[PDB]
Amino acid sequence: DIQMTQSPSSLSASVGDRVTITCRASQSVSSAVAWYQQKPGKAPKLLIYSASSLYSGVPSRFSGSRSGTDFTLTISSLQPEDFATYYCQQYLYYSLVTFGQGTKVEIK
Amino acid sequence: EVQLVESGGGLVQPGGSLRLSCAASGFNVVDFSLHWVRQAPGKGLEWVAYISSSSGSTSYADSVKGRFTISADTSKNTAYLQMNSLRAEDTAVYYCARWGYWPGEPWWKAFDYWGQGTLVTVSSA
Amino acid sequence: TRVFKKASPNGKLTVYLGKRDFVDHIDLVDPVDGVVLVDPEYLKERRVYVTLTCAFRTFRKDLFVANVQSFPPAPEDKKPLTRLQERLIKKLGEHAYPFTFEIPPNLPCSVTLQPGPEDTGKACGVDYEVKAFCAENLEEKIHKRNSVRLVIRKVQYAPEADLEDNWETLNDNLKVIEKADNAAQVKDALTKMRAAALDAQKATPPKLEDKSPDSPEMKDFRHGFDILVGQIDDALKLANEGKVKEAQAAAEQLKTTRNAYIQKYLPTAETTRQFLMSDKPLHLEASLDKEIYYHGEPISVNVHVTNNTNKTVKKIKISVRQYADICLFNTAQYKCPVAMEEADDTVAPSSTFCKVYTLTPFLANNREKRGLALDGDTNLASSTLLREGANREILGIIVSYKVKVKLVVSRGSDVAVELPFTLMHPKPDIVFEDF
Ligand SMILES: C[C@H]1C(=O)[C@]23[C@H](O)[C@H]1CC[C@H]2[C@@]12CO[C@]3(O)[C@@H](O)[C@@H]1C(C)(C)CC[C@@H]2O
């Protein structure tokens, strides 16, 4: 099936700085990529759907961009409540749902 | 409001069977498609199966293709994922998710409401 | 980094440039960011100038001209120097000086080199020319050894074809679905075309550029692709269930929406003739699959014949023709065929026929044509983009392409249709290299 990889496995930054997570898909998915945030011990939460649209309720410091098969999620000024593991996902069809591996953000 | 609740998590011997339910409140199941997402302890997410409940269409992951069975009912608003003989490599938490149908925006808001998760463990102790 | 350079027979100047052919962005044309190096020893009193000429050529006329003086740079017009100009000046000695040209639109193509052409003069064409020369005054005698002249081209590239690429993917995957064997190939093809269709739904067709995002035309356009994605979804569902043949049967339904898209957005033509001693008309309909074609890419023509008369069709002729009108005061017009197909298909009375004819227009077979329009390894002239309110009387050479499908009928004018199309080219330390 379509395999999706995340380049940075672990990333370290402090509060207020800029951080970016990248995600590449082996096969063309037409902006059918979503980003999730999972704190330790809770359910995953949708942040950007269609790789560019911010879901309702999520703060406005998140943003996602697509260029071909390259998807990048940025948090312009991360805060103490932004530390969790983020996941990539493609949803082209029901039976072809794959998730990328985790990216962890810590305090430098 | 909109919320998902599941139950059935427990410890089962390998080759045993267990039933998991995905009860939905605040929305009728027949207007949405329900999926199963499994997370190993210390690993990433994995997609198991899904049902549509509008045409009866189902599909399964390549790891549990021949073992699990998924079905749903409309009156009770619950999705059931039967588990057959378990191979002890599926000891993981289990989340339930919701994805709308094609025409329009509901398709693009993929997995907007998840569940809380349940623990199913396979062992021999 | 790549720059070019030309010296002089007397070695008193040199001209450098960053490019050979300067693209034309419709709204604006990329500037000529040249550089000149001069030896002041011989030119101890004189000066040096750089000139640009856009001319049609003994019969010779010009269309645009502009001059710039290298030094003294005291009236430093266009004082913002582009990066490459500054780097070239700083890299080389202190005697290099800058200049820049900006040009309004014109026509860049040439005509073929054959004896006895169809226009005034011999070995005609329109060419651009950068030139630098040395003197004290702008009317004196010119010493060819102390001069220089270069040639540049105003190439003009084709727009993006993301929608065309998406449709090509969809058609290829539908074909491989039709020829498939087992479930895996069907599944892979359907996944590919589902991705392509979702991508294509975002894009906007060329016929609604001036229409608004919320225009009803755009709503119908998106509704069509919604229906198409639904049909692909049904086929994928049947295939995933296990039925391969039923998946193919469900996939055949995509041809109807492809036809609906063609009749609304693609080049199409239709004529109808009913002879005497007959009761029902003869109908001929053709359509090309794309509006833009690249030099060498095949051109495919659909053809449909629904005869209802008592005569029989003997053969079908498919041709690609070049229309090249010379926008001078003489407004000469002419045309020349480029590619031709002569299939011997027959249509019975009260019958139906349908096939796709694909032909490739290129210069190898057209070396003997007398007035065929060339580019400027030369190929056929790319189609001219239409004027944006500019006067057509002073354009130059406007070249366009048409496709003709003609039927031949026994027991005897024939019946034929035209399908305009666009033929263009796709948008793609320092050491001096000879230009
Ligand atoms: C038989 C050949 C021929 O004579 C053609 C071509 O080389 C070829 C067919 C077409 C003519 C010509 C276009 O180019 C021609 O060279 C030219 O002589 C023709 C006229 C005089 C301008 C009028 C009709 C026609 O436009």
- Residue B102: CATH number of its domain: 2.60.40.10
Q: What residue's CA is closest to ligand 1, atom 22?
A: C334
The token pair at B68 is 């699990």
Sequence length of chain C is 435
CA distance C416 to C353: 15
Residue C175's Cβ-count burial label (10 Å; 0-12, 13-18, 19+) is exposed
Distance from the CA of C391 to the center of ligand 1, in angstroms? 28
Which residues make Cβ contacts (< 8 Å) with residue C403, sequence separation at least 6? C286, C288, C299, C301, C318, C319, C320, C321, C418, C419, C420, C421
Work out how many domains chain B is built from and give that number.
1
Q: How was this structure determined?
A: cryo-EM
**CATH for C269-424, among 2.30.30.100, 3.40.50.970, 2.170.260.10, 2.60.40.640?**
2.60.40.640
CA distance C229 to C252: 14
Residues of C in contact with B57 (CB under 8 A): 237, 240-241
Q: What is residue C220's three-state secondary structure?
A: helix
Distance from the CA of C400 to the center of ligand 1, in angstroms? 17
Q: What residue's CA is closest to ligand 1, atom 4?
A: C370
Which residues make Cβ contacts (< 8 Å) with residue C394, sequence separation at least 6? C63, C327
CA distance A35 to A91: 11
Nearest C-alpha of chain C: how many angstroms from B58? 8
* Amino acid found at B108: W
Helix axis angle for C244-251 and C183-202, nearest 10°, is: 30
The token pair at B86 is 């378990």
Name which of A51, A54, A55 is nearest A64 in CA terms: A51
**CATH for C162-263, among 3.30.565.10, 1.10.760.10, 3.50.50.60, 1.20.120.10?**
1.20.120.10
For the beta sheet containing C352-359, the strands, ordered from the edge strand earlier in sequence to the opposite edge, are C268-273, C282-288, C299-306, C352-359
Domain extent for B85: 3-122
Name which of C196, C107, C142, C152 is nearest C15 in CA terms: C152
CA distance C416 to C194: 37
Count CA within 13 A, CB hemisphere, residue C244.
Answer: 13
Residue A57's Cβ-count burial label (10 Å; 0-12, 13-18, 19+) is exposed
CA distance B106 to A99: 20
**CATH for C2-156, among 2.20.28.120, 2.40.50.220, 3.30.360.10, 2.60.40.840?**
2.60.40.840
Q: Under an 8 A CB cutoff, do A97 and B116 touch?
A: no
Q: What residue's CA is closest to ligand 1, atom 15?
A: C370
To the nearest 10°, report the CA torsion of C380, C384, C385, C391: 170
Q: Which ligand 1 atom is at minimum distance from the Cα of C369?
A: 7
Cα distances (angstroms) measured from residue C285 to each of B107, C303, C306, C358? 39, 6, 9, 16
Pairing of strands A19-25, A45-49: unpaired
Q: Is the CB of residue B111 less than 8 Å away from at least one CB of chain A?
A: yes
For domain A4-106, give the CATH superfamily: Immunoglobulins (2.60.40.10)
Cα distances (angstroms) measured from residue C97 to each of C39, C144, C263, C398? 11, 22, 58, 38
Beta-carbon contacts below 8 Å between A and B? 53
Decide: C36 and C132 in contact? Cβ < 8 Å: yes
- Neighbour-count burial for C1-23, b at 16+ CB within 10 Å, e otherwise: eebebbebeeebbbbbbbeeebe
Q: Give the residues across from B6 on adjacent strands.
A: B22
Centre a 10 Å sphere on the Cβ of residue C435 and count the other Cβ atoms it contains: 14
Domain with CATH 2.60.40.640 in chain C: 269-424
Pairing of strands C2-6, C13-17: antiparallel
Cα distances (angstroms) measured from residue B77 to each of A53, B74, B100? 30, 5, 16
CA distance B38 to B9: 12
Torsions phi, psi of C237, nearest 5? -60, -45
Distance from the CA of C323 to the center of ligand 1, in angstroms? 12
Rg (CA), chain B: 14
Q: Is the CB of residue A93 less than 8 Å away from at least one CB of chain C?
A: yes
Decide: C294 and C426 in contact? Cβ < 8 Å: yes
CA distance C179 to C169: 15
Name which of C283, C323, C224, C300 is nearest C417 in CA terms: C283
Centre a 10 Å sphere on the Cβ of residue C88 and count the other Cβ atoms it contains: 24
Q: Which ligand 1 atom is at minimum distance from the Cα of C370?
A: 16
Torsions phi, psi of C194, nearest 5? -65, -45
Which residue of chain C comes nearest to A92, CA vs CA?
A: C195
CA distance B23 to B9: 14
CA distance C381 to C398: 10
Cα distances (angstroms) measured from residue C15 to each of A86, C81, C102, C136, C435? 56, 17, 17, 19, 10
CA distance C33 to C77: 14
To the nearest 10°, report the CA torsion of C324, C328, C331, C333: -20
Please report all neighbours of C, defined by 3+ CB atom pairs within 8 A. Answer: A, B
- Neighbour-count burial for B21-41, b at 16+ CB within 10 Å, e otherwise: bbbbeeeebeebbbbbbbbee
Q: Which ligand 1 atom is at minimum distance from the Cα of C335?
A: 26
The resolution in Å comes to 3.5
CA distance B79 to B32: 11
Pairing of strands C431-434, C2-6: parallel
- Give one DSSP letter per residue of C67-94, joined into a string: EEE-S--SS-TT-S--HHHHHHHHHS-T
CA distance C289 to C306: 20
